[PDB]
Design a protein around this ligand. Structure first.
Ligand SMILES: COc1ccc([C@H]2CNC(=O)C2)cc1OC1CCCC1
Ligand SMILES: [Mg+2]
Ligand SMILES: [Zn+2]
Length: 321
């Protein structure tokens, strides 16, 4: 079983990694093994003097805080976003662009980006006067929570993976991670995309030229947001599994709403839903506009990813008539 897991992990640098198989082969530890593999591949343990035992202790602890009974926003999704970010970071157009600390920040942010997710949306938490919404004043409720949990867990016994970073490095990484995870709030999508389009239009090359730090964090924010919204760009057998999972989570939220006498949110009514039309709409209005813009920034590095997205859109559309 360990040999079979080792075989699947050879594809860690490839779009379309069999992440569900890795989750099963690792004994429900996809986040831990994928993060460990990526840290080794990028030589991050040596660069930041991270003890291996500390890294594993932190990762297992973090993974434990993803909920086992939430269909989509679980440790498998975290592992997938981590691995997807890892691939985007290695795009030829961005070679030598980011510092080792910026790379560490992006991968760490991806790992913690949805930790302790309850399987319901920010709007649901707000509308139900939840403890989380009261704590966070209705603003990036989940995302603020994911960050607080991810950082707080570093303080557990033998969990501080940043113990050998300088004070300056820890301060910088903390700010970058906060800026990145907050950008995963799906209410910020339109502003994030508008800013990304402006960067494409004012692009300078010779490899992308991002001498300014404010431009670099903006690229990392969009990168992680792309990874978060990468399901429809993956091979169809993976994409369909992600669709099944998000719909299960949405339908469960709708059951909670219906039990409370609340109006059922869009796409959350199992008795009145069109999964296929909803995926086509999701791609057309959100995912394709985002990915076409990313592809333009790194042209032509992401062409195969965009082609797959387009093929998947056509497939889902073809099932409707
Ligand atoms: C695989 O699909 C999806 C994958 C990811 C998301 C993110 C944005 N909202 C979330 O809760 C997470 C939505 C999806 O589809 C939604 C729109 C159509 C139905 C669900
Ligand atoms: Mg999220
Ligand atoms: Zn996510």
């Amino acid at each position: 079983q360990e040999d079979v897991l080792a075989k699947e992990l050879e594809d860690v640098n490839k779009w379309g990694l069999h992440v569900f198989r890795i989750a099963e082969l690792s004994g429900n530890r996809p986040l831990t093994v994928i993060m460990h593999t990526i840290f080794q591949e990028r030589d991050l343990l040596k660069t930041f003097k991270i003890p291996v035992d500390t890294l594993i202790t932190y990762l297992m602890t973090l993974e434990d805080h993803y909920h086992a009974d939430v269909a989509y926003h679980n440790n498998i999704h975290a592992a997938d976003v981590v691995q997807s970010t890892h691939v985007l970071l290695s795009t030829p157009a961005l070679e030598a662009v980011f510092t080792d600390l910026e790379i560490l920040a992006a991968i760490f942010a991806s790992a913690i980006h949805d930790v302790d997710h309850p399987g319901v949306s920010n709007q649901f938490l707000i509308n139900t006067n939840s403890e989380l919404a009261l704590m966070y004043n209705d603003s990036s409720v989940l995302e603020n929570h994911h960050l607080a949990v991810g950082f707080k867990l570093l303080q557990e016994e033998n969990c501080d993976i940043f113990q050998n970073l300088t004070k300056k490095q820890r301060q910088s990484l903390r700010k970058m991670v906060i800026d990145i995870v907050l950008a995963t709030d799906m209410s910020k999508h339109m502003n994030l995309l508008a800013d990304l389009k402006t960067m494409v239009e004012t692009k300078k090359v010779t490899v992308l030229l991002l001498d300014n730090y404010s431009d670099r964090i903006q690229v990392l924010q969009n990168m992680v947001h792309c990874a978060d919204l990468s399901n429809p760009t993956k091979p169809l057998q993976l994409y369909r599994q992600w669709t099944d999972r998000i719909m299960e989570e949405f339908f469960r939220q709708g059951d909670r709403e219906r039990e409370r006498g609340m109006e059922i949110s869009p796409m959350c009514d199992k008795h009145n839903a069109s999964v296929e039309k909803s995926q086509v709409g999701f791609i057309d209005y959100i995912v394709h506009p985002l990915w076409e813009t990313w592809a333009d920034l790194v042209h032509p590095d992401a062409q195969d990813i965009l082609d797959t997205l387009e093929d998947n859109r056509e497939w889902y559309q073809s099932t409707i008539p």
